[PDB]
Amino acid sequence: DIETTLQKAYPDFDVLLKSRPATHYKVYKIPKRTIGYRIIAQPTPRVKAIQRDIIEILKQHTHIHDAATAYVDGKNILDNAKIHQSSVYLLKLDLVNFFNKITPELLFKALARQKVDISDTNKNLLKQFCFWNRTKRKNGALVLSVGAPSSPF
DNA sequence: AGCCGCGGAACAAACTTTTTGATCCGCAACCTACTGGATTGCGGCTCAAAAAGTTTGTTCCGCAACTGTAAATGTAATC
């Protein structure tokens, strides 16, 4: 249900398909409060609209498990601590490779386990319009970027 | 996600500084007067030889910031 409605709005999907839209990413760096520089790659002002639309399309047939207050609608940071108020101890994990190592190979099989079917052309569309190429070269390695509007879901 | 020059390193032949195992030669001893044989013996001193201790020329190992079309965004706070 992605390729069917892709050309309905802004019928320019014929172009920008072969012109490496994943490359359309600006890289800057924000200073942390302490040691560290955070690289952020965000799409051009045009790609974010397409990514938001495809997020809305994807949300039609998905389910997100509870106890994961990670960017779900109407759930601020307070409910994260509301569950944890009655405890006495805590063990805080912190995952490494912040969103920059989630390859597209690990999303299609995740959806397959999720029991949702996706077309091969739709799979190519997902791989091409919702990821970032750091090497900026053809047939490169695709990694999710911290900053894309499609990163949370 | 790829891998620049830089500098230690893991090895490995050459120098190089002593550990050892004889050989010697005064050197006081016998013996008796004194070179006594036709003698031993005994302790410093020196000898290369070789098992130990550096020293130096070569070969891989590792690692950083960002990449070719590309966002200035009123306030606070999250990954």
Q: How many CB atoms lie within 10 A of CB A13?
A: 15
* Rounded Cα–Cα distance for residues A28 and A101 (Å): 18
Pair A51, A33: CB distance under 8 Å: no
Experimental method: cryo-EM
C-beta neighbour count of A113 within 10 angstroms: 7
Give the max Cα distance, chain A: 57
Resolution in angstroms comes to 3.5
Residue A138 CB partners (closer than 8 Å, separation 6+): A20
Helix and strand element counts for chain A (H, E)? 5, 4
Query: Which residues of chain A (89-128) touch nucleic strand B at CB < 7 A?
Result: 95, 98, 100-101, 103
Tokens of A145: 């970027």
* C1' (B62) to CA (A89) span, angstroms: 41
From the list A99, A109, A110, A107, the residue with the least C-alpha distance to A143 is: A99
Pick out the nucleotide with least CA–C1' distance to A141: B1
| Nucleotides, chain B, CB distance < 7 Å | 1-2, 66-71, 73, 78-79
- Closest-approach nucleotide to residue A49, Cα vs C1': B71
Alpha-carbon distance of A132 to A9, in angstroms, equals 23
Residue A68, classified by CB atoms within 10 Å of its CB into exposed (0-12), middle (13-18) or buried (19+), is exposed
**Is residue A88 classed as helix, strand or coil in its secondary structure?**
coil
Residue A32, CB, less than 7 Å from strand B? Answer: no
